[PDB]
Amino acid sequence: IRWETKSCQTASIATASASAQARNHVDAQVQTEAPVPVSVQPPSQY
Amino acid sequence: RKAVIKNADMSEEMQQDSVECATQALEKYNIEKDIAAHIKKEFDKKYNPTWHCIVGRNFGSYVTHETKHFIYFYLGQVAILLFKSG
Numbered sequence: 001i002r003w004e005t006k007s008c009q010t011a012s013i014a015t016a017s018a019s020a021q022a023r024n025h026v027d028a029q030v031q032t033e034a035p036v037p038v039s040v041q042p043p044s045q046y
Numbered sequence: 047r048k049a050v051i052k053n054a055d056m057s058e059e060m061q062q063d064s065v066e067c068a069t070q071a072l073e074k075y076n077i078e079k080d081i082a083a084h085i086k087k088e089f090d091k092k093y094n095p096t097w098h099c100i101v102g103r104n105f106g107s108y109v110t111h112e113t114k115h116f117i118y119f120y121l122g123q124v125a126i127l128l129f130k131s132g
Contacts, residue, residue: 018108018111021107
């Protein structure tokens with residue numbers, strides 16, 4: 001005959017943002033040098 | 047399949063389990079969709095749903111996860127993103 005009223009509640013939760021990324025690239029530039037440290041005719045005496 | 051973890055919000059035991067699970071997945075499955083599916087299902091069974099897995103060589107993501115249930119790591123050249131949300 002005794003009806004008791006009760007109130008229930010569950011705990012809340014917490015989320016968080018995040019990200020993923022594959023490997024990254026970057027540019028590059030090269031110029032080949034053309035040095036010619038060469039004389040005309042060295043008179044050798046080997 | 048050498049593992050390198052880049053980011054995690056996860057217990058150490060689950061981190062190791064994730065790497066071992068993904069490592070087996072790559073040994074067993076050739077196609078990324080099937081690798082991802084295997085990994086996802088193993089976590090739903092052990093760690094409750096709802097898990098999601100992304101497996102690949104070229105992607106970015108922006109996702110929302112439940113605290114303590116996120117990891118992002120590589121196995122060699124393949125990235126695996128594993129998290130719970132929902």
